[PDB]
Design a protein around this ligand. Structure first.
Ligand SMILES: [Mg+2]
Ligand SMILES: [Mg+2]
Ligand SMILES: [Mg+2]
Ligand SMILES: [Mg+2]
Ligand SMILES: [Mg+2]
Ligand SMILES: [Mg+2]
Ligand SMILES: [Zn+2]
Ligand SMILES: [Zn+2]
Lengths: 117, 100, 96, 55, 120, 68
RNA sequence: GUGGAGCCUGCGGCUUAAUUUGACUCAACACGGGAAACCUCACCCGGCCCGGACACGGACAGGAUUGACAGAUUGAUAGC
């Protein structure tokens, strides 16, 4: 359901919910405004990835673990310029923390169901 | 009863044509009306130079600007005066009606 | 020109909500007159608006001390594309 | 920062302080009744404003 | 030979004397100018003057602290400190002995360059 | 044209790759222990660290210092 | 009357970092609405800063980099 996850992330961008970058993510985890966090992997981050993993394990933070940073950046879609074509040169993003005003959606609910399964 | 109109304007013929029309309307609807009290109109005075630079001749204006006031007092209910006042006014004229 | 991201989005929203815009050409302004609810100093609006102009989004006219900008349909459509709004809602000048 | 520098010089009075809202000039400001304009813009705009050559 | 004396006042009486009282002492514009007050630009002068007296040796002028206010009365707070008064181009070095009170720092860096008529 | 002073350089900001990494303290068990003072502000209830100068504490986003 | 006289203002000359720069019968010379302390202001002098838009480069959300509380010669609470 990656097309659905893409649509949900885009709607969260439309509504201006998402609180992002590792530092704002640590802030949102401390404030307890994270409903799901996602972390990049397969990157030379021995301590960073270990820290954010224990931080999410600290208190009530769900963890997605996406593989590539360049891929995470192209998924989230920050600096998409020249939309009549491909993103020209994605820069690899590591972490995203969703805060969700617009929770009323079938894709979001099917993700919560997938998590239930 | 006592409503007090204050008519001011920059231009004169507009002020007199409007105020005369509203008074004539008041005579038509039949109620105590004070004639248009021509207050003495004032005169605003300004003197400028034509020159761009310092150096041409030093020329001066003698600018007047008269501002004329009429005023009309009626002894009548409010709604009838609203009926006369809505109709018969023109751009230059400025009507200000004090209620008491 | 240092905007707060909050202003970038709220100013684009301002351009949307009223299609057209007027502004005094005055660098030495603490607050903007017509739009004094927000601080948005006239220098901020001026420099952003000249940046929009530079990229074709506003039509220019200058009187006394005061620029006058007409927002074009490219501007309307770009603002709704940035803010991801529906095509139903509109500015007050578009709405009837 | 820049906010305590940008416009820090005091503009409290004089034709230098206020200025024409047309020219931004400090020459002949009509300050009576708050007209606030230079002798050149005044001469330019007198008819529109309503001044008139009576005498 | 002796200590100085303003009207009925010794310099020591001048130094340990309040500012408004010192105003009533010295001249109308000057007593007024204290009554009206020093701005930020002049306060940074006073602190930087204290630091210069702290760092200064005994047998030495204190280090120079610059100020553009040529229009500035040298007060007893200021006495015993160097200030670099701005001409616009340069800062003129002034040590301010107690007789300097009621005078401008601008006085000691003349603005017009003094005249000599037949130069060439 | 020849200059007296060399040109002045832009302040090279002391970049650290994964600077947030040194903020928290790693453990073999699943935990994090925020050691240095935490701001009591609502925007950063706890996690965000304060500057640790040689002499006295200081807070970054809101700019606030506490001398010794 | 003025002119001689003391002085107001505007002007020449000089010097000056700069005295932005204009005019010499009328049609230059209290002229630039020129009563400019700063501002004006241009001119000049130290140093910042970009208010070098926008486009495209790079850059990079593992935070580009402005703003940024310290101490240091600084007018100043310019991270200059
Ligand atoms: Mg005489
Ligand atoms: Mg003579
Ligand atoms: Mg004159
Ligand atoms: Mg002059
Ligand atoms: Mg003067
Ligand atoms: Mg200058
Ligand atoms: Zn004008
Ligand atoms: Zn703090």
């Amino acid at each position: 359901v990656n097309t659905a996850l893409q649509e949900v992330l885009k709607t969260a961008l439309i509504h201006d919910g998402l609180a992002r970058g590792i530092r704002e993510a640590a802030k949102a985890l401390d404030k307890r405004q994270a409903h799901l966090c996602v972390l990049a992997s397969n990157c030379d981050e021995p301590m960073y990835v270990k820290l954010v993993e224990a931080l999410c394990a600290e208190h009530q933070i769900n963890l997605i673990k996406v593989d590539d940073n360049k891929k995470l950046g192209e998924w989230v879609g920050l600096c998409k310029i020249d939309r009549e074509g491909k993103p020209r040169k994605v820069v690899g993003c590591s972490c995203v923390v969703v805060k969700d005003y617009g929770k009323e959606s079938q894709a979001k609910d099917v993700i919560e169901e997938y998590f239930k399964c | 009863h006592r409503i007090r109109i204050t008519l001011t304007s920059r231009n004169v013929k507009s002020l007199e044509k409007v105020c005369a029309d509203l008074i004539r309307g008041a005579k038509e609807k039949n109620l105590k009306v004070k004639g248009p009290v021509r207050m003495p109109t004032k005169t605003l005075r300004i003197t400028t130079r034509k020159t761009p630079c310092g150096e041409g001749s030093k020329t001066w204006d003698r600018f007047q600007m008269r501002i004329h006031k009429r005023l009309i007092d009626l002894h009548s209910p409010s709604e009838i005066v609203k009926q006369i006042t809505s109709i018969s006014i023109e751009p230059g004229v400025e009507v200000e009606v004090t209620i008491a | 020109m240092l905007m707060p991201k909050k202003n970038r989005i709220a100013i684009y929203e301002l351009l949307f909500k009223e299609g057209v815009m007027v502004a005094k050409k005055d660098v030495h302004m603490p607050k903007h007159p017509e739009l004094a609810d927000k601080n948005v100093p006239n220098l901020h609006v001026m420099k952003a608006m000249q940046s929009l102009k530079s990229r074709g989004y506003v039509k220019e006219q200058f009187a006394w001390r005061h620029f006058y900008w007409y927002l074009t349909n490219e501007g309307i459509q770009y603002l709704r594309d940035y803010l991801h709004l529906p095509p139903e809602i509109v500015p007050a000048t578009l709405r009837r | 920062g820049h906010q305590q520098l940008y416009w820090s010089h005091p503009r409290k009075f004089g034709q230098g302080s206020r200025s024409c809202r047309v020219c931004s000039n400090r020459h002949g400001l009509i300050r009576k009744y708050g007209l606030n304009m230079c002798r050149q813009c005044f001469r330019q705009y007198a008819k529109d404003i309503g001044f008139i050559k009576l005498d | 030979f002796r200590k100085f004396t303003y009207r009925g006042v010794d310099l020591d009486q001048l130094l340990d004397m309040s500012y408004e009282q010192l105003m009533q002492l010295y001249s109308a514009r000057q007593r007024r100018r204290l009554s009206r007050g020093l701005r930020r630009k002049q306060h940074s002068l006073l602190k930087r003057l204290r630091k210069a007296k702290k760092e200064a040796p005994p047998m030495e002028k204190p280090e120079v602290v610059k100020t553009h206010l040529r229009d500035m009365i040298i007060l007893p707070e200021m006495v015993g400190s160097m200030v670099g008064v701005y001409n616009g181009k340069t800062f003129n070095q002034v040590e301010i002995k107690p007789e300097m009170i009621g005078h401008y720092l601008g006085e000691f860096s003349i603005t017009y360059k003094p005249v000599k008529h037949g130069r060439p | 044209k020849s200059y007296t002073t060399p040109k002045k350089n832009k302040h090279k900001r002391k970049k650290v790759k994964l600077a947030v990494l040194k903020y928290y303290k790693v453990d073999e068990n699943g935990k994090i222990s925020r050691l240095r003072r935490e701001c009591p502000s609502d925007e950063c209830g706890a996690g965000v660290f304060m500057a640790s100068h040689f002499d006295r504490h200081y807070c970054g986003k809101c700019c606030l210092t506490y001398c010794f």
